[PDB]
């Protein structure tokens, strides 16, 4: 029996909660309210961040996802999906799924943040006068009690302040107009300001929202670009399509692109780069050649070279304000399913007349591949004759893309058709269809089958429906989660079916034979959300890690993944103020609390904690012989963190980690940086570089110190460190 702490809960919000969201970079859980809302909530101290109601349409069913493989957030409703990311340590989640517009007169939500609104505000004040274009009292008056409104919450709560954005509700066109002025304004006086880039940035999202206002991309010999079109990254990178130098090592596009330039070649095969600032002629570029250490020695007059503010656009501002893309150009059908698997850099949606669309969410946001499936295909035919005029209905119910060896997608289908009895009667039969992915550079084409797996009988003789596709930890094992398909005895919780990646031939395949059934006879029991815990977690045949599922009546059961058996119980808790069960409804796993966070019937948050000196052979009474020692010397080596950890910084540093302080006195006396490592393991030390200023006549008296961060609950030091001076784990030095 498994020991399983509760330390307490928390309350979020009295409307309930469906669905649970944590993103691991920002220790933020994205609670999915059952109006549709996002409630932002950050996992340090117990405070909530953010709200959000994504722009979406009124009554819409909101589902959110994370992947942190691709480190994205997928947001699903019954119209389009969007796809968002982290940007300055917020999330953009006010116009996360807003539709693109077709007419420049359609008013766009416009969210900016608070240090590019003070920006903005400043520079229209002081140095912009842009009193002649058209709607900029409008822009004036939304900016001042935006501002206004946010300054109070600025003083509270710091990470409050950063999430909280304004949004503008203004014509798109107007917009438009107001940043081209801006830009204009701020380049025809030669000064340097902050608020240049964050007008570029808004002119070059509210071109992305419309499809209308993006001119087809003229690269050619003999034809000049647009450089205030190619203001924005992506379309410098874009420009590289015809590099003829992209296996060069430091000639590449995605590299080379960054610094600032475009491809505008003189014929076909030449590598004329040139800058959209300055304009600095480069030819015979070489595969040693530094693009920023290149753009230094040609042009060190460039303000990219000294880092100052230009009209660039990021491309990071541009994915975090990426519009939704509908699954299909009608816009009509409604998204049954959706989902991500061991290959999730690809963004599948299908629909309920068998139309999938999957997207390259991990480049720039694009169309990948469109197609319908045909549930007349002759696999299919004859797994239903094998099963027993001819009609078939096909409803796919859950999606997973599983790769290794090109990726293949993985659709869980439903089969309805019409048999005799043995008057007609439609029964229902679950499969697996495998479709490619990959286009050809007899392999098959993409939008064919691939493998037409068949569940089995007691699949089709309870008329189950796959619920839920999940690839395991180990990339060689597939659960797929059953349930009781609705219709428009003995009533079972569904199934848990373990099978085997098979990986003989070129195209991910899977095996006939299921590798585990595992059965769920309490119907009160029937799985509604599953999560997979690692297994270094507990390091502080072979296992396969343990796996957390809510059920219908709230009993969140861990069991383990080789044979399914129940390790750890928790029963749900009781509603405030009566005996009714707060009946858990989702589940995710927490980093930064190292907590189940679950999601309750009435909206609660709980957290749940798994896990809870002599007699140990030490390292110190032996004799001093030359092996023990030999051992001691190669413990004490220090190795390289791999890969990236996290960690967020105040607003006032601009971008192994490095930063750049710019000259800002609002919070001048106190800075907190925060770490949060991607593992909790043997902390060896951590290392701290900083750069002075040039003129430094007088050594400073400024000091550091390193601090635990405290799990929330569920001479003289400063006074910031004299509020957490008993949890202090380094310095003052
Ligand atoms: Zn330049």
């Known amino acids: 029996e498994w020991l399983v702490l509760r330390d307490g809960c928390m309350h979020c919000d009295a409307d309930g909660l469906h669905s649970l969201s944590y993103h691991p970079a920002l220790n933020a859980i994205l609670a999915v309210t059952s109006r549709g809302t996002i409630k932002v909530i950050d996992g340090t101290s117990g405070a909530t961040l953010q709200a959000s109601a994504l722009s979406a349409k009124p009554g819409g069913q909101v589902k959110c996802q994370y992947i942190s493989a691709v480190d994205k957030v997928i947001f699903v409703d019954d119209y389009a999906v969007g796809c968002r990311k982290d940007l300055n ?37 002081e140095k912009v006068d842009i009193s002649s274009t058209e709607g900029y009292d409008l822009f004036i008056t939304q900016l001042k009690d935006g501002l206004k409104n946010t300054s109070h919450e600025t003083a509270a709560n710091h990470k409050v302040a950063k999430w909280a954005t304004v949004t503008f509700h203004l014509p798109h066109h107007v917009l438009k107009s107001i940043a081209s002025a801006i830009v204009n304004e701020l380049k025809k006086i030669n000064q340097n300001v902050a608020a240049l880039p964050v007008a570029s940035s808004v002119m070059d999202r509210l071109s992305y929202l419309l499809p209308s206002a993006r001119p087809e991309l003229g690269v050619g010999p003999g034809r000049s670009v647009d450089r205030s079109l190619m203001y924005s990254e ?93 699954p299909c150009t009608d816009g009509t059908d409604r998204i049954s399913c959706f989902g991500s698997g061991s290959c999730p850099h690809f963004l599948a949606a299908a629909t309920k007349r068998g139309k999938i669309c999957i997207w390259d969410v991990s480049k720039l946001m694009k169309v990948h ?29 859950a999606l997973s893309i599983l790769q290794q060896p090109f990726p293949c997608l993985l659709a869980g ?20 269809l495998l479709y490619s992915i990959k286009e050809s550079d007899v392999f098959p084409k993409p939008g064919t089958l691939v493998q037409c797996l068949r569940l089995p009988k007691f699949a089709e003789e309870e008329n189950l429906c796959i619920d839920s596709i999940t690839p395991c930890a180990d990339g060689i094992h597939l659960l797929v989660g059953l349930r009781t398909c609705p219709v428009e005895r003995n009533v079972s919780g569904g199934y848990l079916v373990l099978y085997k ?20 006879k309490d119907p009160q029991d029937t799985i509604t959300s599953l999560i997979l815990l690692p297994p270094d977690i507990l390091d502080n045949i072979s296992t396969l890690g343990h796996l957390v599922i809510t059920t219908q009546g709230g009993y969140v059961k861990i069991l383990d993944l080789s044979n399914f058996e129940i390790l750890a119980k928790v029963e749900p808790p009781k509603k405030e103020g009566t005996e009714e069960q707060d009946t858990f409804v ?17 909206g609660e948050l709980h957290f749940l904690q798994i896990g809870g000196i002599s007699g140990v052979d030490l390292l110190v009474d032996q004799p001093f012989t030359l092996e023990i020692l030999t051992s001691l010397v190669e413990l004490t080596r220090f190795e390289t963190l791999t890969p990236r950890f996290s960690a967020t910084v105040p607003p006032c540093w601009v971008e192994t980690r490095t930063w750049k302080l710019q000259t800002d006195s609002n919070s001048w006396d106190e800075h907190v940086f925060e770490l949060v490592l991607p593992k909790a393991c043997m902390v060896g030390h951590v290392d701290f570089k900083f750069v002075l200023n040039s003129n430094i006549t007088n050594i400073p008296q400024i000091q550091v110190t390193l601090l635990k961060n405290k799990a929330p609950g569920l001479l003289r030091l400063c006074p910031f460190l004299e509020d957490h001076k008993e949890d202090i784990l380094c310095g003052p030095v």
């Open 501 to 520: 990646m098979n990986y003989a031939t070129r195209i991910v395949t899977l095996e006939e034979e299921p590798i585990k059934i595992q059965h769920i």
């Open 369 to 397: 591949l469109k197609f319908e499936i045909n549930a007349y295909d002759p696999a299919i035919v004859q797994q239903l004759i094998l099963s027993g005029a001819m009609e078939v209905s096909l409803d796919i119910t």
């Open 89 to 125: 340590g917020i999330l953009l989640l006010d116009t996360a799924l807003q539709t693109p517009v077709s007419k420049q007169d359609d008013v766009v939500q416009l969210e900016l943040p608070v240090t590019e609104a003070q920006q903005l505000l400043s520079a229209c004040l």
């Open 234 to 326: 992506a379309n410098r990178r874009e420009t590289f399509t015809s590099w003829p130098h992209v296996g060069y090592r430091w000639a590449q596009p995605d590299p080379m692109a960054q610094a600032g330039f475009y491809h505008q070649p003189a014929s076909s095969g030449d590598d004329r780069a040139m800058c959209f600032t300055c304009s600095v002629c480069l030819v015979c570029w070489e595969p040693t050649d530094e693009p920023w250490s290149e753009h230094e020695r040609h042009s060190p007059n460039c303000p990219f070279v000294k880092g100052e503010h230009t009209q660039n656009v990021p491309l990071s501002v541009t994915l975090a304000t990426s519009p939704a893309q509908f």
């Open 413 to 432: 289908g439903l089969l309805t058709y019409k048999s005799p009895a043995t008057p007609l009667v439609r029964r229902t039969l679950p499969v697996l």
């Open 586 to 602: 989702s589940v995710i796993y927490c980093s930064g609390t190292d907590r189940l966070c679950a999601c309750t019937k009435g």
